[PDB]
């Protein structure tokens, strides 16, 4: 039976899993979404006239950058209790990743839902971003708005983009980042908690080798790429479990550890699920993780196919959209980017 998010506005508890130091935690664990008297409606495919084109963060046009910056500012200007707000969007990650919800609607009320460390990783984050992106566009009245993505698979894209840097006057800024790493700029996709004392051009090569490892060498079939099968009745898979998929366990995890501030109690913001969404770069990193799924299929290598197990296809989550409506979405409906009306600007 598939994992099925409950009525998230009716059944939700404070996050209490996967956070090592709750006492010193600098972000809230009260991650439940607002209740607006809305009823949960089934998803409908968008009728956008044009496909939104996500852009590499290191090569944005002035309009793309200004629009993104304006949109995030508008999101920060919203009171937190608005489901579209900066903090509400961040809390989504905390609720789904740190034990906000249970499998009650599947008949397992004493087991939490975890979307990480299994085959739910890719489609959950695809949907999370889909609504996030459409909300941002709505706040600035740009119907064709698209996110940037952090293209760390290409040398020019490996340095964290300057658009995220500066001070609080920049809406894209977050103080809770590893200051030494921000100074280094070039992300280490192989980062395991110890700084490599190597030249930039060697780090570039390390990063190339890592993307190749995750998408070709280790992502050899759906189970090894998407992650292990996880269904109703299953307990949460631990971080670092052997069954975690190649991208999630690899480059994905490295970027979070690298950007997260080691002087904070749980390496907030990016260094823990529950706080990661408070960093604007979280979503832009994840937009390239979303692109990895596309790239993996486009490789047209043996085993690079989408999952067809009904307990994956029919798994579902609940998100607020840009009209503040509650929407239930299914894994099966996010596999085709044309039908979701976005893609990525490629070389």
């Amino acid at each position: 039976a598939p994992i099925t998010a409950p009525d998230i506005t009716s059944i939700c508890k404070d996050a209490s899993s996967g956070i090592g130091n709750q006492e010193g935690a600098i972000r809230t664990r009260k991650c439940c979404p607002p209740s607006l008297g809305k009823k949960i409606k089934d998803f409908q495919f968008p009728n956008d006239k044009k496909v939104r084109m996500r852009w590499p963060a290191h090569k944005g046009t002035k309009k793309q950058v200004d629009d993104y910056r304006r949109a995030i500012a508008a999101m920060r200007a919203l009171p937190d209790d608005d489901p579209r707000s900066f903090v509400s969007q961040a809390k989504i990650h905390c609720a789904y990743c740190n034990g906000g919800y249970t499998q009650v609607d599947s008949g397992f009320p004493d087991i939490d839902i975890q979307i990480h460390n299994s085959w739910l990783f890719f489609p959950f984050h695809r949907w999370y971003l889909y609504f996030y992106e459409r909300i941002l566009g709505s706040l600035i009245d740009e119907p064709n708005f698209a996110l940037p993505y952090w293209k760390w698979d290409e040398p020019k894209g490996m340095p964290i983009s300057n658009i995220f840097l500066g001070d609080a006057s920049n809406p894209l800024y977050d103080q809770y980042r590893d200051a030494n790493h921000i100074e280094d700029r070039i992300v280490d996709l192989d980062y395991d908690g110890k700084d490599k004392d190597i030249p930039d051009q060697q780090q570039v090569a390390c990063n190339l080798s890592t993307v190749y490892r995750d998408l070709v060498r280790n992502g050899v079939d759906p189970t090894s790429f998407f992650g292990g099968k996880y269904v109703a009745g299953d307990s949460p898979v631990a971080n670092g479990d052997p069954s975690v998929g190649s991208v999630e366990a690899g480059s994905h995890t490295a970027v979070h550890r690298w950007v997260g501030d080691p002087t904070q109690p749980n390496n907030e913001d990016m260094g823990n699920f529950y706080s990661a969404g408070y960093d604007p770069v979280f979503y832009i990193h994840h937009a390239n993780v979303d692109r990895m799924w596309k790239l993996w299929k486009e490789l047209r290598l043996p085993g690079h196919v989408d999952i067809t197990d009904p307990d994956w296809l029919n798994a579902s989550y609940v998100f607020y959209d840009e009209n503040k409506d509650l929407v239930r979405v299914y894994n099966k409906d996010c596999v085709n980017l044309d039908k979701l009306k976005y893609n990525f600007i490629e070389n």
Partner: peptide, 4 residues
């Protein structure tokens, strides 16, 4: 072995 560029990742050392």
């Amino acid at each position: 072995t560029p990742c050392d």
